[PDB]
Design a protein around this ligand. Structure first.
Ligand SMILES: CCCCCCCCCCCC(=O)OC[C@H](COP(=O)(O)OCC[N+](C)(C)C)OC(=O)CCCCCCCCCCC
Ligand SMILES: CCCCCCCCCCCC(=O)OC[C@H](COP(=O)(O)OCC[N+](C)(C)C)OC(=O)CCCCCCCCCCC
Ligand SMILES: CCCCCCCCCCCC(=O)OC[C@H](COP(=O)(O)OCC[N+](C)(C)C)OC(=O)CCCCCCCCCCC
Ligand SMILES: CCCCCCCCCCCC(=O)OC[C@H](COP(=O)(O)OCC[N+](C)(C)C)OC(=O)CCCCCCCCCCC
Ligand SMILES: CCCCCCCCCCCC(=O)OC[C@H](COP(=O)(O)OCC[N+](C)(C)C)OC(=O)CCCCCCCCCCC
Ligand SMILES: CCCCCCCCCCCCO[C@@H]1O[C@H](CO)[C@@H](O[C@H]2O[C@H](CO)[C@@H](O)[C@H](O)[C@H]2O)[C@H](O)[C@H]1O
Ligand SMILES: [Cl-]
Ligand SMILES: [Cl-]
Ligand SMILES: [Cl-]
Ligand SMILES: [Cl-]
Ligand SMILES: [Cl-]
Ligand SMILES: [Cl-]
Ligand SMILES: [Cl-]
Ligand SMILES: [Cl-]
Ligand SMILES: [Cl-]
Ligand SMILES: [Cl-]
Ligand SMILES: [Cl-]
Ligand code: NA
Ligand code: NA
Ligand code: NA
Ligand code: NA
Ligand code: NA
Ligand code: NA
Lengths: 311, 311, 311, 311, 311
């Protein structure tokens, strides 16, 4: 078996389509997802053409070994996809209709800047390397691009699965390469983060602020230090679920800013005590009374600035 | 080998049956389970018919390669099932009786709303794609559907394994697909959650309420803050064992509600101290005495409302 | 190749034997173990018989493909065993002596009721499905059942590896099945649990009881609450190493009971303080003096009751 | 299929090239990385020579099994590479152009001395063992060495992918061996470590130093001990992400040095209290006032010395 | 293909050699290591002898299928080794020279008694089972035993790779089995354990001893209890990195002994307070002054006894 010879000097168009059956294991740390889907390939092989009246049959079925099939690969996969040929059908004019069911672990970078209120565009890149006989160009058959209704990616909302119809045709190692970008638009289900991380973290911070209504240094030290320890636990929990980004994430920014609030609260609690011992509680009382409004106001305004910078 | 030709224009019925040998690894976070079972297929191939008199035999055994076998796939599997053909038997009328032993990792969504007092319906979807020659239909042979008595899924009670007899008949990528739903009804063994999570969590909360019988702010701050830290540990332990759900879970609702009780206790403890310093323990004593009944009553009533909303 | 035809209508006895070479990875959470062993099969195929005089040879060696070999499977394996045929030898009378070396991950339930002072019986189930031509029955060749002296399962003592000689012959999906039960009796090496979990847990509890020799509520609250936090850490450590059981485990019972002791200690510490503030330390002193004997005595007697109920 | 014969007594040159498609999973603990690339091999096998007029084609395509292909292995891989032959093209003179796409987990030691401000040189070693008939020598075809622009290794900056053109030709087990060094220079994206580990760790340390502005031993003990516990959490978090090195790492050195600062702070806090009880707060006040400048100055100077020693 | 027939009744000698290429993943918990090496086999098969004059060749290359190759297995491997035949050469006298490159996960028990100051001997056991026509005995070809200079096992120093020249011949299931032991002597790089575990653990213990210079029960309770919690964290960290041993380990012994020191310190701190309240600080002062010397002296002497018992 060899590639079909050209009529003129035209390239061989291989019409593609991916129909998603399953989407699972979107690992944020690894920036990988798992996909189980149908891959459909269609090209014309004039050698395979037949007379439908003389042959009786309207379609002829071939085994992969029996005919020429273009070597389609996925660019962004960990290892080569596991594939099982579903069907190969040849029409009287010689149009080959290949279909396979594959499973692969796809490497697709994520943007965590707005986490956990972020949306992503997952990619699946199809590629074909040209041959010495003739160049192979990829196309999108929109009728064969889709996803089944039941496709669920845990903790994500699937927005759309579409292909960028114009292929990226470039030279690689003195041969032509035809690349196709299949995009899966998803958005994170941020709900869980509110009762699991966001609200517990705000509560422990507000509990620390009750020290602004207490003159007891020993009890204030306990309050602020203990709540800071609880905050560290949440910070660690959050960073163990995320990859190391060279940029600041929304959650990471909030978490870091809260450390400064704990630090300033310690300074206040210390200032309040130093003045009390120094026989001047009049100055301590004014600082503490100010902190009661200052701390929540500055926190609320700081978060407004942060949200603005990130969204 | 090609599919058996129709006598008239009837579809080709492939009678199915799944006999569960093993059920293991029900991952809640991944919403996947592992299954090891027998798959039995039965269809009529008139080309394989023989006269038992001149043949000498009543049944003829074939190798998978020797005859046409329908391409049955599982919809909701991670990767294609690992299968080993056990037996292929042909009766004189050409009724083929295929049997294989398979192992597969099944993707089946779970409903955590009532966790850990929840029941699930695990699905195993069988599918066959029709060919150009004819429409391949799936059926259920109820005599060949079951599970062995010893089938145990750790931390779960297996209620029933039944098949939805009527198949789904739809078109996918210009060919008819015939899907069957094999349902495995299970219910969670909630027992362990009571001494491991529920009761320890209630005890640490009740220990915090002993601050309503103490005038010592330093000791109260220690009590409430330290028990809140213990509660955070339990919250983290629970959420590390569950997937991120876009809905509130029963356990999650209880856990979140308890954070508010700790927060209100801090407010009370602070109010009690502010009044004591302000030379008015008469107001502090009345608030503290009220909290002694208020906190358990509100907790008990809140849980009644929660349980009602969830069950 | 087809099964050997019967002389009369008797079944084909396949004499089995498992010789354990390795035992590893006994996962308590997963209730699975890994085994690397020799599987020996022996049956008579009269068609393979030869004259040892004219043949010159006393034994004839065959390749698996050359002759009929019975399809022996393992019931409780995760996936089908990885096997490599070591040897196939035929005696002049046609007695086949097959030997293979295999590796498999075995699913075998564990009883954690007496953990970590528990013993288990691991099972390896051999099975053969009968054929249309003749019935196949399994037997045990005790000369070919054993384990090598070096077989070590980390954290376990291997007591015995024996087979239940009488097979379980039952009907499954209109065909006969012959099941064999290979039992591996083991017992847990409980030593490590004493300095790693048991003793540290008792020490933190005894440290809490020093509050019965202190009138300082602030220091008592610190003592009891902090040691309760340490106990939670040990509880979590223990439950992360065990599966969720629908029954109470010995360690789990002890751990839960200790929570009540901490809870009652808090009540005592609170009662002692309430009476001190109420200007009556005479009542507080009598309660505290009683607790000094009551707490250890009740703890020692409670553990006697627990140990009795469990052993 | 033996190696091609020599014209004179020269070795057979196999021109190599590695084109990186994907770089992922750089495990610091395991000192391994995963690579997905194109491997191109080119050698002359005169036996494959053809007349393109007689043959009809200008280039002949062969299946790997059909012709002699040099046994190229990777030295530093865990297991043999998962390879898929992309193309084998033979030109009329017998020049073979082999291309394959592979994936492999490469073992390459890392130097953690300057972590997280460290750069690495990852290695990919190609090897060929000489045969009976003639010696096989490796070469680099620079036209076939590179990496695609999109190649991203999470948490790392890829500097260059180059090959050491002169092979390492040495004798091993009485036969010649030809080794090629492909180097991938990378540098760590240190950014994340600043808000995640470095700054939180400095803040908890500075919070501890507020005890130098307090005379309360009970509050100072709380401050220093609690912040030391938070530091332990960060130390553990850091060491769980790193392998055990026989040398001191930059981060490890900083972390260790901070333990001494906490230890000396405890000594100070104890000294301050012992003098207060001993009725001499004049000595305590002078020590505490000194510590206020001493602790930050010594910390800042110590870090200057550390950074100097490491960079 | 059959084994070479014996001239007299002499057993066949298969000369072995292992040349280590890679050593990685020494899992302490699993007591397994991963190896990538060359296996060389050499035996006389007189049937393969040829005249180098007539044939014109001085060596002959065979494919594994073409000739008899002895079934060499590894005793202590998880699953059968992944091997790729590198070369098979026959000399004119019929001396076969087989070479393969393998990779395997080796199960080799470790002795943790002196951890982390322990040395191990890793084993690689080669085995051959005799056949009905000839007894096979294994030998060591010292010229073909080695390791490459670059072989690195992370956190370990590789001392030597040698073979026990005299095999361990024994009968197994009525057939001779010839076993060979390849010893890889390694010693642990203990350095890291000093700044990561040993020193932090001693510092937290010494910080606890500052309570012997304080009369404040509330501050002493805080000091000793909080440092005990930090010690529990280190104990857990250590035991999560080690398997459950039926013997006491050096680190485990030290860690356990330190629990007693914390427990006795609590008793002292309680005794000191009970005497202070009982209006007799004269007795408390003498006990506390004694503890200042007693605690470090007993600790230092206890460690001398421990180190002596273990080394
Ligand atoms: C305190 C200083 C913290 C500096 C950390 C910034 C690193 C980072 O996270 O990102 C690096 C970026 C670089 O610009 P950019 O990535 O193209 O963002 C802009 C594009 N938007 C709109 C899609 C997000 O920094 C900045 O925007 C620097 C300017 C703001 C400083 C605010 C200080 C408060
Ligand atoms: C500390 C408190 C942190 C609170 C975070 C508020 C959410 C946020 O920061 O933003 C809100 C995001 C918006 O996402 P978007 O619509 O895709 O962006 C807009 C894209 N523009 C700029 C191109 C137009 O989602 C929500 O409406 C979720 C609201 C959750 C409220 C959580 C309360 C706790
Ligand atoms: C804090 C306190 C938490 C208490 C949780 C109680 C259990 C629960 O909340 O519910 C109990 C669930 C109910 O499940 P169901 O029968 O399917 O309800 C469907 C009902 N309809 C059809 C009318 C809507 O299970 C049980 O019967 C087990 C009882 C377990 C008691 C454990 C007590 C601790
Ligand atoms: C807190 C309570 C401390 C735990 C007490 C140990 C439980 C026990 O008493 O354990 C007992 C088991 C032995 O059980 P067995 O003989 O194998 O069971 C079969 C017994 N029948 C068939 C008669 C029922 O272990 C021991 O030898 C315990 C020695 C270690 C003591 C731990 C000290 C701390
Ligand atoms: C708290 C306890 C601190 C730990 C003390 C180290 C134990 C020890 O001294 O361990 C001893 C081992 C050497 O043992 P070996 O090489 O196997 O020789 C055995 C030879 N015999 C059988 C003749 C005796 O390492 C050392 O030289 C320790 C150096 C590191 C010291 C770290 C101190 C902190
Ligand atoms: C009170 C005393 C102090 C208590 C000490 C508390 C410290 C808690 C220690 C943190 C444990 C977090 O757990 C650790 O975090 C890292 C952070 O990137 C995560 O990341 C991990 O990813 C990979 C894959 O798992 C591993 O190769 C590596 O071990 C680790 O980097 C993991 O989830 C876990 O290995
Ligand atoms: Cl393809
Ligand atoms: Cl691919
Ligand atoms: Cl099938
Ligand atoms: Cl399938
Ligand atoms: Cl078999
Ligand atoms: Cl099996
Ligand atoms: Cl190759
Ligand atoms: Cl390789
Ligand atoms: Cl071999
Ligand atoms: Cl092996
Ligand atoms: Cl023998
Ligand atoms: Na083909
Ligand atoms: Na078939
Ligand atoms: Na479609
Ligand atoms: Na066979
Ligand atoms: Na070849
Ligand atoms: Na052979």
């Amino acid at each position: 078996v060899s590639p079909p010879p050209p009529i003129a000097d035209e390239p061989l168009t291989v019409n593609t389509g991916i129909y998603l059956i399953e989407c699972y294991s979107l690992d944020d740390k690894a920036e990988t997802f798992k996909v189980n889907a149908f891959l459909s390939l269609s090209w014309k092989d004039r050698r395979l053409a037949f007379d439908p009246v003389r042959s009786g049959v309207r379609v002829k079925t071939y085994e992969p070994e029996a005919i020429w099939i273009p070597e389609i690969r996925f660019v962004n996969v960990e290892n080569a996809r596991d594939a099982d040929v579903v069907d190969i059908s040849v029409s009287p004019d010689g149009t080959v209709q290949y279909l396979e069911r594959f499973s692969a672990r796809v490497l697709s970078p994520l943007d965590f800047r707005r986490y956990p209120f972020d949306s992503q565009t997952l990619h699946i890149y199809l590629i074909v390397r040209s041959v010495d006989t003739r160049n192979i160009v990829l196309a999108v058959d929109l009728e064969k691009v889709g996803k089944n209704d039941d496709v669920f990616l845990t903790g994500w909302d699937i927005e759309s699965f579409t292909a960028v119809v114009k292929p990226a045709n470039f030279a690689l190692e003195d041969r032509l390469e035809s690349k196709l970008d299949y995009q899966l638009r998803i958005s994170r289900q941020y709900f869980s983060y509110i009762p699991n991380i966001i609200l517990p973290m705000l509560f422990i911070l507000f509990i620390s602020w009750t020290a602004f209504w207490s003159t007891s240094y020993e009890a204030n030290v306990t309050l602020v230090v203990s709540t800071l320890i609880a905050h560290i636990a949440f910070n660690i929990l959050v960073e163990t679920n995320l990859p190391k980004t060279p940029y600041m994430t929304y959650t990471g920014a909030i978490i870091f800013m809260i450390y400064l609030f704990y630090f300033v609260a310690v300074i206040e609690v210390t200032v309040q005590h130093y003045l009390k011992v120094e026989s001047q509680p009049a100055r301590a009382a004014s600082i503490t009374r100010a902190s009661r409004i200052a701390f929540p106001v500055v926190f609320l305004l700081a978060n407004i600035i942060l949200a603005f910078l990130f969204f």
